[PDB]
Design a protein around this ligand. Structure first.
Ligand code: EIP
Ligand code: EIP
Ligand code: MG
Ligand code: MG
Ligand code: MN
Ligand code: MN
Lengths: 176, 180
């Protein structure tokens, strides 16, 4: 498992093993983020396990990860959905293609990522991997957005940025 | 370091070392909770360190803990503000003296408490103890209660229980006024 190093524009230039890649000095690399809703249209919010190297125990959007060499983003989303949440989904759709971001977690670990965002529908029940997810909630995107809007700090900075982007937010609410 | 065990009545019967006291079988014990406001009237919200035995890495109100033998609840609040936040405060005001709660944390640790709740004002800078607190925010009370109303699952339930109590809530409003 690797992350794909990106140059100034997003051209891959190499790889690092995923664990060695996330440090206090994390270099720019490829990523994705996805927002999952159920058939009923509830938003799935997850809490990252205490063993995640970056933002452990943080409430965030449904699923995020790092596409591997030669892997489509949509495939990356599907893979991590199965891996973290043991869940099957509809074909992921673009919600925030240009999302890119850098931040530092309370322990000083950095994530530095070009991160296209997607939305999709689960088509199966969840089967949680507790090495990745320590908790989750099915809720209403409206309340979730109220929450991000009221107390952003209660949530991952990445989740907050995606939901604060006008386009992404409008797309998530129409997805719903 | 211990907790003060209480019988069915809220009456002390002795003590138990703190760590050992908090398990899946936690006995009723004495505790406290405090909501801290700075001079501006902003509420301090904190994120419990990852190493906390109960609700590690969870967002909650400013400070909480266990009064020790011979110590008053109010001196408890004061000591813990110093210990966890390194911050001095005004005399803790009682805002929810009869709060009592039981809850199981994401890993099964139970907390079972008689937990009088206080509010105070800080009178010094923070010196966060990262053995106890991994993150904090200064914010507007109304915002926090909106976050609490919207996604209550994103916070420790104790903060939520205390905050949805009408009088404790009104008392907390009193501390949002600026004060020099
Ligand atoms: C970037 C947006 C956030 O760091 C996505 C990375 O997700 P993460 O869950 O940390 O990666 P994995 O461990 O591959 O799931
Ligand atoms: C009861 C309200 C919550 O469990 C107070 C105990 O909180 P905690 O901060 O975990 O106690 P200490 O470890 O003594 O600080
Ligand atoms: Mg992930
Ligand atoms: Mg405490
Ligand atoms: Mn990464
Ligand atoms: Mn306790």
């Amino acid at each position: 498992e690797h992350v794909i190093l990106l140059n100034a524009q997003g051209v891959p230039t190499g790889t690092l093993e995923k664990y060695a890649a996330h440090t206090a000095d994390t270099r720019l690399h490829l990523a994705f983020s996805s927002w999952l809703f159920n058939a009923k249209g509830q938003l799935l919010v997850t809490r990252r396990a205490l063993s995640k190297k970056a933002w452990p125990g943080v409430w965030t959007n449904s699923v995020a990860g790092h596409p591997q060499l030669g892997e489509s983003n949509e495939d990356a989303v599907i893979r991590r959905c199965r891996y973290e949440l043991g869940v099957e989904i509809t074909p992921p759709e673009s919600i925030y293609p240009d999302f890119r971001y850098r931040a530092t977690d309370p322990s000083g670990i950095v994530e530095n990522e070009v991160c296209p965002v997607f939305a999709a529908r689960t088509t199966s029940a969840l089967q949680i991997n507790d090495d990745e997810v320590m908790d989750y909630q099915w809720c209403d995107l409206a309340d979730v957005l109220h929450g991000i809007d009221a107390t952003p700090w209660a949530f991952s900075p990445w989740m907050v940025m995606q939901a604060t982007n006008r386009e992404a937010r409008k797309r998530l609410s129409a997805f719903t």
